[PDB]
Symmetry: C6
Subunit: 104 residues, 6 copies
Amino acid sequence: QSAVGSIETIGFPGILAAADAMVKAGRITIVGYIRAGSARFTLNIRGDVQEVKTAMAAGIDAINRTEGADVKTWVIIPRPHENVVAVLPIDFSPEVEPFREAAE
Amino acid sequence: MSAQSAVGSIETIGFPGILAAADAMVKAGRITIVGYIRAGSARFTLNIRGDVQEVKTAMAAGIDAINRTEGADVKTWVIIPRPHENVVAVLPIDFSPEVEPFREAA
Amino acid sequence: AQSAVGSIETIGFPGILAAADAMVKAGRITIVGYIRAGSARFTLNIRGDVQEVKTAMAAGIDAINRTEGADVKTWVIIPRPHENVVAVLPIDFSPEVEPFREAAEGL
Amino acid sequence: QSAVGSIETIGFPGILAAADAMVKAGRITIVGYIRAGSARFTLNIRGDVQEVKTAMAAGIDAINRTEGADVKTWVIIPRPHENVVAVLPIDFSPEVEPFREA
Amino acid sequence: QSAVGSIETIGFPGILAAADAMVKAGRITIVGYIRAGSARFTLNIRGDVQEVKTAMAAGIDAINRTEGADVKTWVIIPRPHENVVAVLPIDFSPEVEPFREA
Amino acid sequence: MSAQSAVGSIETIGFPGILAAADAMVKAGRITIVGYIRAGSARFTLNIRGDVQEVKTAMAAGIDAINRTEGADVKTWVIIPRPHENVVAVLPIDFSPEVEPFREA
């Protein structure tokens, strides 16, 4: 299992900013987002651990430059367990398969 | 060829504000409104696509329209000039058959 | 030519029920829908001739403000909404409200 | 169109208290409830205007007697327009027709 | 109609604590739960009124021992009207039919 | 015959925190993650099943992972060692086809 990164902000424009900065800074795949409630949004990515760290640094900085946005919470799990991947929305799906291949 | 068109995103509290933004934006720039999100806590997001400069013009018009609306305020906004294809595939900012007549017209 | 759209929002369902009834009785308009916006806020959306929407809107504001526990949070009137707006936001007519559309215009 | 009454409280236990008190106090029909958000719940009833007034009074008192509940907002509309009944969830349904008839 | 009890906590762990304590303390059937919003959860139970009383006290005690939980609101209706049972989510279902029998 | 396995439940603000807790719990104890809840107000619940001591060990690890996570805090948690069947029937803590593989290991 490749590493997983997750980041959360208030507002959709912030997570859009995070998304574009993350995928351009690191060789990673965006696998999903969550409408978390209370206008908070989460973005989830996968990749080599060093690449997720690089991307996450970029996503933090991008949210903090976005009007009205700030980083609420984030984490990186270097090697997620299969039970985690099965239950939480962090697995790959056919719609992002083309981007996984490009990254690897 | 062409790159992905720019994406603009704006958010306010209350639906009347986002209605004001939508109408001002599409009248002020050569853009397509591609969707809206009921974000929670009575916040609404509007997402638009178009040439970078038309998105910048539309966004100024949207900001001004929200600030003129009773009980509305701009909470947050962004423009991404050249969105990556992975972003367009995962987040609700792509075109759809419903709005395809308007992309055409733009 | 796209008819005007009016939108109004309050905290709590009773206040939006009050708005809806006052609006439809005060102006020759059609109520086209409502939104459960979140945080117990509710939106009502109406269509009709611009002057009828204005009259209906004034009546709705006053009805909400008279309702126990409610007040007007936000509202707007767009005289001539763009087709891209009508297509994306829930402000278009539907079969369920066509009978009301016809009556307002026909009267 | 018979009258409509609507009441809203914080928490489900209060709306349950209101529902039971209203239907026992007045000749009315409970037509629906709404999970409004933020743990608020709405109850909507139909009936003759005087019966709706009687039920509403009983509903408010029941909420105030309920542990942790408070009345947030309420209204009565004597003669709701048909467009209102068509768009908002205040109409009768097969599930409550037996109660409409009684 | 048997009695109905309804209780609401902040957080899911509390409603889980309540549920387990309630069904062990009295001869009741848990009939459903509600994700109410704002991280509040409601539990609904049915049974003889004395058994619902016994269960409710046990639910309250259990919530108050649960880290981070709190009782927000609760009620007991001895004999709910059939209109209430039809509209609000407090009736029995096939999934809980075995527990109703005991 | 067999008793119902123990259930643990934990809640924090934000998804990153629940992700941290899930990975730490499943690695620390012989447990199955059976589900999560988007609780509202950006709070997320995670529910796990296992032997009583394994759930206890997993929960301690989940609490420490949430507290180490930027922007997360443990809001509430509980362990029920022996949940009643009616509870498992009504609340979302039962096993499912998706997690059957993990139950067996």
